[PDB]
């Protein structure tokens, strides 16, 4: 009896369910910012960017009200843009496993001048997105679809869904099917095949998969396959630390620049958070010495993954790369600071990124905006002074009708990241208790590949870790418990929607900033008592001290 | 309706670039043209394996300037040689006009794209490709129907196509209105790089060949005289510095003169001494 | 005990020296990178 | 306390060493790139160049030159040129394809 409950808890269904309920209840996304943004979108690039940002802010909240209102504007998407929109639909519905097949069937395919294969592939990839890291029940359906999939675009979307749902499971059947799809030797599906091999055998250190993938990367001719296999090789060796030195050397000495980029990504993933001085030395030597711009950018951004566990040491090393003559090195330094100090709101990082928001090179500006949004997620004006200024900067860049299209794309995604999940999520590569959150690391790394493939940007939704404090009873249901934040209400409140006591009371679930968790206590008058000290926060069990009848938090409906 | 991606790249082979440059210079001041051989690896890659020139014709660079018989015999006979690559596209040199397509160029490109949808019309400037910069661009087309209905000519899925900025000259001559510039990437493997490195690899000899001692003394005397004059200028400037709160420096010119004297003299001494040791009677 | 303090002060002086040197090298690289960029 | 401070000191010294080696390597590569850029700037002064008359200076780095081909252009001055010798109607050589006051 009780063991079944423990298995239910460990399987994650209850945890994702309560996270989803917290997101729906505390859904405070502002639609006016998106209204202005869609007012200021002219080209298809900014259109896709707006779609992605809408997905980002409604990530997991299952609130597609913006898309429902602006279906006419959404219909302008076509080809891979339509694919990306259909995928973002899944990011909106993150965690909605129960009615996943039914809801995807509500967007049933059709027939028109586009073969709707983009729609099918986007639906498959969105289905994989809903079941990120938890595809245990969708795996067989997606396997059957992929084996039965005939179109190329459908194959790409399905491979992405398979890899992302079976992330890290290291199952052999899915690996074999995706290896078959990769060996079908096609560019459009090859990116998805390589990424899916990276996801499925994530952190496995398997000699067979690595050998097959490296050999194919040295054998094929399609560059998209090369990028997919590069990120796949990176993800297969995740967190393996010094065990990956042989592969790291073998990819560093490769003649192909894509393989050198793969080696840099592998250096990032194997030593994520270690701060290993040898890995930092290799990364810096490559970033200042390599002849290919992309490899320099990858090497210098990998410092973020290496140093995220010590963010205060990180601007000290990336500041000089921020001023490098090479525009790719500058963009990589921006992304390294954004990855490195993600969700920390570091003051030095922003003091670095502020002058870099006006770099003459457009993609450097886009990267600076993305990184600033990553760092300032959920931050408030008192916590970090420049947040409002950066919001104004994003709005100006969107409303500047002469700024470059890439810069506008970056600003759209920055707006989406800043208010992600209705200001209810942050980016935390570290776990609550100090672990490396593998889904967050993988999602951020693959999101950095948006430079090469726009639909890869939805992978960032994995890094969206809710900033919530869930109190549970012995039944595991949710009692109506109120928590006390011993701080000024405006210190960690929601940002003022677009148009005084020293404490505040917070209900269950409690949306609490990671800095707010420190000063958040619980009143003595409350009949419950925290089990683990409330400073660590997160899913917290409250021990009841009275037999007075419990009033449970009424479960909100979906959407 | 499928649209060519903005990430599509034209992988120009190294020798393809060399042949294009040589043929473009040869034709100056006239315009030359030739056919580009390779394979359409995928929808995002065009690999120009090779190029062969075409006879200069009185028409200029047009679709009547491609001799069907010459094109044929060259194609079958190169296939016999071991280059069985489909004709990817064509090229012609705009000498000093920059890279763009004139009305006849778009006409010929339409003729070429009648053969295959993926077919580029790269051009090269043989005189603006002075040492350093190489002025070559690759345009395919913009079908009139796609533009007039308002849809963007190419779908975008990455920043690859936006890394480089289009030029005003090409823009006025119809870029982004009748044709789009495809990013050009140079497939250069290590073997070809090492072989090209022999162009300026001096020898194993001049690493041991001493510079003429009399010329060495004259160079040294000239440099030390220049060091004299620069040092006098430095002394005068520094004497001014004291009667100067923060408000060509003889110092820098002095410094690079010092650096040149350093390298020349130290190299001469060391080289002479190694020549004493290794080039020994024993 | 006092051994801890002696090691700490020695590492502290070494760190001050190396930080001052690193600031100097960063300034040199700054001016050289500015020249290259110009 | 004491031991943690000692460990932080040793870690900070190690990180300082990493930054030191990185900065040395980047200094070497930047010197190489600076030499290459200087070579490019010197090469832009090659021949042939069209003669022109330096009409008037506008900025610290741009000027108006009347090219001997019979047309006046607003062009860019090369940085290395001594400004003091740039006097009105001084004959200047301009880049053939950009007319920059070389
Ligand atoms: Zn022409």
UniProtKB/Swiss-Prot annotation, chain A:
Signal peptide limits: none
Domain of life where this protein originates: Eukaryota
Keyword Transferase attached: no
UniProt PC repeat ranges: 84-117, 122-155, 157-191, 192-226, 228-261, 262-297, 298-330, 332-366, 367-407, 410-442
Modified residues (N6-acetyllysine): 401
Molecular function GO labels: enzyme regulator activity; ubiquitin protein ligase binding
Keyword field: Acetylation, Phosphoprotein, Proteasome, Repeat
Gene Ontology biological process terms from the UniProt entry: proteasome-mediated ubiquitin-dependent protein catabolic process; regulation of protein catabolic process
Listed GO CC annotations: azurophil granule lumen; cytosol; extracellular region; membrane; nucleoplasm; nucleus; proteasome accessory complex; proteasome complex
Subunit structure: Component of the 19S proteasome regulatory particle complex. The 26S proteasome consists of a 20S core particle (CP) and two 19S regulatory subunits (RP). The regulatory particle is made of a lid composed of 9 subunits, a base containing 6 ATPases and few additional components including PSMD1. Interacts with ADRM1. Interacts with ZFAND1.
Protein name: 26S proteasome non-ATPase regulatory subunit 1
Swiss-Prot record, chain B:
Modified residues (Phosphoserine): 129, 203
Keyword DNA damage: yes
Top-rank lineage group of the source organism: Eukaryota
InterPro entries documented for this protein: JAMM/MPN+_dom, JAMM_MPN+_peptidase_M67A, MPN, RPN11_C
Stored SMART domains: JAB_MPN
Annotated motif JAMM motif, positions: 92-105
Protein's name in the database: 26S proteasome non-ATPase regulatory subunit 14
Pfam families tied to this protein: JAB, RPN11_C
Molecular function in Gene Ontology: endopeptidase activator activity; K63-linked deubiquitinase activity; metal ion binding; metal-dependent deubiquitinase activity; metallopeptidase activity; proteasome binding
SUPFAM superfamilies, per the entry: JAB1/MPN domain
EC supergroup of this enzyme: hydrolase
Entry keyword annotation includes Protease: yes
Residue span, MPN domain: 10-145
Keywords: DNA damage, DNA repair, Hydrolase, Metal-binding, Metalloprotease, Phosphoprotein, Protease, Proteasome, Ubl conjugation pathway, Zinc
Entry-annotated residues carrying Phosphothreonine: 245
Record-listed Zn(2+) binding positions: 92, 94, 105
From Swiss-Prot, chain C:
Residues shown, of full length: 21 to 58 of 406
Function: Component of the 26S proteasome, a multiprotein complex involved in the ATP-dependent degradation of ubiquitinated proteins. This complex plays a key role in the maintenance of protein homeostasis by removing misfolded or damaged proteins, which could impair cellular functions, and by removing proteins whose functions are no longer required. Therefore, the proteasome participates in numerous cellular processes, including cell cycle progression, apoptosis, or DNA damage repair.
Stated family: Belongs to the AAA ATPase family.
Protein localization: Cytoplasm; Nucleus
Species name: Homo sapiens (Human)
Assembly and oligomerization: Component of the 19S proteasome regulatory particle complex. The 26S proteasome consists of a 20S core particle (CP) and two 19S regulatory subunits (RP). The regulatory particle is made of a lid composed of 9 subunits, a base containing 6 ATPases including PSMC5 and few additional components. Component of a complex with USP49 and RUVBL1. Interacts with PRPF19. Interacts with TRIM5. Interacts with NDC80. Interacts with PAAF1. Interacts, in vitro, with the thyroid hormone receptor (in a thyroid hormone T3-dependent manner) and with retinoid X receptor (RXR). Interacts with ERCC6.
Name of this protein: 26S proteasome regulatory subunit 8
Primary gene name: PSMC5
Coiled-coil parts of chain: none
Swiss-Prot record, chain D:
One GO BP: blastocyst development
Main localisation: cytoplasm
Compartments, record wording: Cytoplasm; Nucleus
GO cellular component: ciliary basal body; cytosol; membrane; nucleoplasm; nucleus; proteasome accessory complex; proteasome complex; proteasome regulatory particle, base subcomplex
Top-level lineage group: Eukaryota
Molecular-function annotations in GO: ATP binding; ATP hydrolysis activity; proteasome-activating activity
Keywords: Acetylation, ATP-binding, Cytoplasm, Nucleotide-binding, Nucleus, Phosphoprotein, Proteasome
Function, in words: Component of the 26S proteasome, a multiprotein complex involved in the ATP-dependent degradation of ubiquitinated proteins. This complex plays a key role in the maintenance of protein homeostasis by removing misfolded or damaged proteins, which could impair cellular functions, and by removing proteins whose functions are no longer required. Therefore, the proteasome participates in numerous cellular processes, including cell cycle progression, apoptosis, or DNA damage repair.
Family: Belongs to the AAA ATPase family.
Protein name listed in UniProt: 26S proteasome regulatory subunit 6B
Species of the source: Homo sapiens (Human)
Protein's gene: PSMC4
Positions spanned in the full protein: 39 to 140 of 418
